[PDB]
Amino acid sequence: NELLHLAPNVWPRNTTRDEVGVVCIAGIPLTQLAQEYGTPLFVIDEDDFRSRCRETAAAFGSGANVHYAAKAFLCSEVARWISEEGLCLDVCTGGELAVALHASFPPERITLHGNNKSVSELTAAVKAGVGHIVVDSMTEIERLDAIAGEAGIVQDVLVRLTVGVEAHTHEFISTAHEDQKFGLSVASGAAMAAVRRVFATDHLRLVGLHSHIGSQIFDVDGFELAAHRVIGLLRDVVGEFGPEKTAQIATVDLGGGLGISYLPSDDPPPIAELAAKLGTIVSDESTAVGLPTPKLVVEPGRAIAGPGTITLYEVGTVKDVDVSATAHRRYVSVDGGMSDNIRTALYGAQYDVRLVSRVSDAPPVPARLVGKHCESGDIIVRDTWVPDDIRPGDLVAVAATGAYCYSLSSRYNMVGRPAVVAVHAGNARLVLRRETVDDLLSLEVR
Template identity: 45%
Template sequence: MRGKWMYFHGTSKINDKGHLEIGGCDTTDLAREYGTPLYVVDEALVRQRAREYVEAFRASGLKFQVAYASKAFSVLAMCVIAEQEGLSLDVVSDGELYTALQAGFPAGRIHFHGNNKTPEEINMALDAEIGCFVVDNFTELRLLNALAGDKGKKVNILLRITPGVEAHTHDYISTGQEDSKFGFDLQGGAAFQAVEEATGLKHLHLLGVHSHIGSQIFEVEGFRMAADKVCGFALDVRAKLNYTFQVINLGGGFGIRYTNDDTPLQVAEYIKAITDSVRTNFTKADYPLPEIWVEPGRSIVGDAGTTLYTVGTSKDIPGVRKYVSVDGGMTDNPRPALYQSQYEAVLANRAGEPAAETVSIAGKCCESGDMLIWDLELPQAKSGDLLAVFCTGAYNYAMASNYNRIRRPAVVFVRDGAADVAVKRETLSDIIAGDVIPERLRKSALTNG
């Protein structure tokens, strides 16, 4: 089977029954107990990935914060694990902030991102006394200062800048004017103007700057380019404003392996390149070494997630393709429909069997575009088989929807043979829990009746 052995990450393996096992739990037992679709999270692998970042930074000798980007997968249990592993936490909405606070995550280690934070969200974060706001634009800069002033507070901020470096996998582009909805443009002068204004606002304390150069990055050159740009900007600010940055945040975007075509580096390689580049740039300029922050999300939870589906119907079009349908799809994993994302999978209940045919995995939504995997080699799939799709820990549950009024799956964390529900499966009652029939419609129905 193409790539079969490549995708047994973490604690995953084929057990003596020929079934896929994760965290010491037989996936057929998980499907029987919790139903499908089912998100399965390998807790040991999540913790391993988090520790790889922390240990790599400790080896550098620099001050640091590793902030888990909770937009990748935000649930109470994940926030607890992030806290236990010594991570900080990025949030981008009141919902993510509320989740973190309800999980007991220390507010002082929460960073609030986003290009359009509402006054209500800002006030909620101010009341919680979070550690830092990552300010995205002038409107927010002034609003945050005013709202903090209303509460008699002075809050830490980073300014998000667009450094003119874009990195996606192997492609690096340095542009003069980056076209992005996020951040203050460096080349056009907005970033310098933002620093100048921020340092004059009495309810804000400017720690430094933030930059983010892309997603699914498999090389280090983009981070080096960004460090060069940020260092040059820091020197310009010091020379003209006599202001020294304490923090440099180089964002996230560290890639993971979804298929054989993906070639990510080890976490330690990314971090060494970043810290070496920062150390070289700032030391050479006789600039005090700043604290380095990064924001991994996908690379902590992505390959720790597996989604289990039950195979239903099949459709064979001779000379064209064979479709195999499962009981989930774009409602629990919209990424293939949105980004043409690619995944690999096995039949979890027949994981030791050789491939016998090439099929395409279709979801159950009433959309032609609801396809999970094209051209997957599997044993001959039968109704009732269990399909395991790998590397679904990031941006799957987080982006799930109730399209077609399909219920969202449960999430279970597995470790050392134990499985624990982290998110309950939605019920049919949950689907209509927020629905209200307006009274005028009830009266109309009675009148018409």
Template identity: 45%
Template sequence: METKVTAVNGHGHLTIGGLDTVALASKYGTPLYVMDEDAIRANCRALKNSMDAHYHKKGLVLYASKAFCCKRMYRILNEEGLGADVVSGGELYTALQAGFPAERIYFHGNNKTADELTMALESGVGRIVVDNIAELELLGALAKAAGKTASVLFRIKPGIDAHTHNFIRTGQIDSKFGFALETGEALQAVAAALKTPGIRVAGIHCHIGSQIFDIDPFCHAAEVMLGFAQQVRAELGYTIEELNLGGGFGIRYVAQDDPKALESYMEAVSKVVLGFCETNSFPVPFICIEPGRSIVGDTGITLYTIGSVKTIPGYRTYVSIDGGMTDNPRYALYQSAYEAVVANKAAQQKDFTATIAGRCCESGDLIQENTQLQTPAVGDILAVLSTGAYNYSMASNYNRVPRLPVVMVRGGEDSLAVRRETYEDLVRNDV
């Protein structure tokens, strides 16, 4: 399976953004993340243009930083006119260090610390998404003490089953995130905020899950959220100005995946929003969405060097690579499906069944099991596709393995976006 950023060249090698992955592996070493910056920018523009078209330029695309976060990424987002959704002080700090405009930053999280909220207030972030009453009270006190006003959204659980993995479903009543509608706590929270000094209620937010292929759950979520906005107006006399509908649009990891075009989501949901507002004489709110994976996920690959091919007769063959769960923990966590290619044999047929094993001292350190590859050999370069999201951002130093570098490809040129960690980096904070 080729992706939107990969192809096979005349040497039979896998390419990304037109560049030979075998040559990139030789130049930068492995393991290595490679991302197509042109494709990232194209995704940003497609989403922004669709948002502008369907909501008459009264909306904002917020990139979900947790998918992939580094200073280069924030510079790209700024140049493309997007906003940023951050979920920690670290992501906020990175964005600010990259010169990203604070007013286009929305700060999320279910347990923000006082220090993080203070940083958000001092830097002037555009919105703080409040998750619970304790946070509302803390934010109000901090804002009052600082002589500032915090513009907030409330994270609402719309009770939507998004048909996705249990670990990445976030819209149901027993989720750790946000306020429930069914219990009345969401309405109580808005009522409390309207009376809290230092707090300005800007709007409401929801996010129903990740890697969702169906459009209907997004449409249903929009209906539920607008219904709640109507309830707020009717019972509290306050008109919600902003509606953030979150993200979660699915991408293609393997051939069986069938994601809809991003334009399809935007068109369908906008019809629901505009239709509801017209029918109920409700002012159309400023609309935000928070795509992450759908901007970067299928723009990246990871390159490894095969260190051994170990066959256990009658059982399986392990193809061992010089990376693993430290750079891609998603198979260990979710049994996530990936497509893999022997990059220097990409033109050949896949005729070999293998389990891709990582280098960690951990039996669960696998990337895929019983997957099809071109016949592998020691020293071959293995590429795992669609690793642009939740790989670098979820990487760890387990077994004291240094984190990988990130190379960006743009206009047929490659450049380093994140340096490879060194052993010295690993001990830098040890005392």
């Protein structure tokens, strides 16, 4: 009855149910996908993903202002999607760049991020003609300058700032000293020292400022404090160097962390509403300090890739576990685990799980969804409810696994990566194939 419901904020946009009670994505029964492709299976609702690109692009004025964070999930097919939808792509190490270039992603729409970019990654970035590099340390700045001079080019950079704001859901914390790896402290003068260094060179050009402040952010307040702090530095810079050397500092990038619904009760605002608030903040903040309004750029991963994909599993074992003298928890063992979704164990993530191969009339029963790994903490959904007649051979799906589940996949217990399939308009296609024993053995020498 209520265990049947697929909260529209949580599930992919193109989710329906059958007349026989099977959940379909983009018109295809989940049962047919498991039949054709096996389980576990990442199922991507392509129209959903593309929708999020378009709405976010519209919300921020242009696809140019929306940089997809590849770390959420990347492969050549997805790089193609982002390319066609007109967004930019943020890449983090050499491997993400090479996969983008392999996919012929236009390098001028690429930004390179990272706290510890090697010489060889910086080298490859400029050789490829990557549009922007977000610099994270004085050392990087030295390195990049030498590399750009060698190549005979002027590299566009942003400097990553630490502004003491950490935002999650409907709260944020402001600290005097952010104690983490990324960026340079505005407060300490470290950020201004970086700005000076970039100005002192010939082969680099400072075109913006970057901050990233959290994840699953549902309110604008963290961003507003962050924006105030970032533009305060802007004020400091053009104050010291004059609106002339600074004219080209045209971009404030407020990073990622746009929030999605994992659970029905999750309540991120519509992106159009949040984006307009952000736009008003940036204009207000810049006028408040006598500056022209900079371009606002945003770097979502989760908010593009997360909601449109589910993980489909087969129930293998159902065990009733005594938890008190009178209560029980129903442990439902499934086809994968921390190998394909480590987020529950790693971050304490909370997911929605539903029976998707039939409609049960059995009453709900408190449950834990667990994997097949030889570790007690191999838990996929810690606290949930299942039909009292859940049985091996039933299919269940976990929602919003499109971001950072596959990106984090391992071969723990020699469990190969699941296949990943894209559905569009009643048609399914394999995108990433499932790993085999040969894959498992492939790094072994002889």
